[PDB]
Amino acid sequence: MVLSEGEWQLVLHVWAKVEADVAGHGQDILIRLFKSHPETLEKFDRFKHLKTEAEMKASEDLKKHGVTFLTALGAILKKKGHHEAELKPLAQSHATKHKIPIKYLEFISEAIIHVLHSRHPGNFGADAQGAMNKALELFRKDIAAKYKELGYQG
Ligand code: HEM
């Protein structure tokens, strides 16, 4: 796919809001994912033992990885589709080292959309959500293409 400039503007406008509090958004999204899809937590040797949401919120390690992840994602979105270079090292580590199936990338996409809808209802109307979903779909399509090339495809 290819997003229009109008669609990228909707994505980047809400993302600017997200950037006012990177750690907080990173925390909310990861917790959303872990509660919605508990199996995903089993991929993190460092977070695997966290039993409750209270423990997840208190984990400094979890908050740090949330910032690392959001920062990587923000760098990709800001490329407005020209993210080939950024996708390479990311697809290799997640396919070969972490072994994250494509199914899981869909789970986190839903979590991101849920949190943005919760914290920014005014800047995340129907048009803005469709634009963000289009951006994430584009990301997943390219990542899956890289997975194939790397010999994985999960
Ligand atoms: C938009 C999606 C994603 C982005 C931008 C992203 C980004 C990152 C980044 C930057 C790291 C750091 C270095 C590395 O690549 O190993 C990382 C690590 C990791 N990611 Fe992701 N990731 C994404 C989705 C996921 C998903 C869906 C899972 C699991 C359900 C996952 C599991 C992991 C694991 C297991 C590690 C390493 C943790 C550690 O031992 O430090 N990632 N990810």
User: Is 93 close to ligand 1, i.e. is its CB under 6 Å away?
Assistant: yes
3-state SS class at 129 = helix
Range of the domain at 137: 1-154
Contact 117/133 with Cβ under 8 angstroms? no
Of 123, 121, 19, nearest in space to 74 by CA: 19
User: Is 108 close to ligand 1, i.e. is its CB under 6 Å away?
Assistant: yes
Is 94 annotated to bind a ligand? Reply is yes
Structural domains in the chain (count)? 1
Output the CA angle 3-4-8, nearest 5 degrees.
75
Q: What is the resolution of this structure in A?
A: 2.1
**Rounded to the nearest 10 degrees, how much is the dihedral formed by the CA atoms of 22, 78, 14, 33?**
-50
Reading the block at residue 98, the tokens are 């972490």
Contact 17/120 with Cβ under 8 angstroms? yes
| Experimental technique used to determine this entry | X-ray
User: Is 77 close to ligand 1, i.e. is its CB under 6 Å away?
Assistant: no
CATH for 41: 1.10.490.10
Contact 47/59 with Cβ under 8 angstroms? yes
Contact 32/24 with Cβ under 8 angstroms? no
User: Is 63 close to ligand 1, i.e. is its CB under 6 Å away?
Assistant: no
Q: How far is the CA of 129 from the centre of ligand 1 (A)?
A: 23
Is 114 annotated to bind a ligand? Reply is no
Contact 58/149 with Cβ under 8 angstroms? no
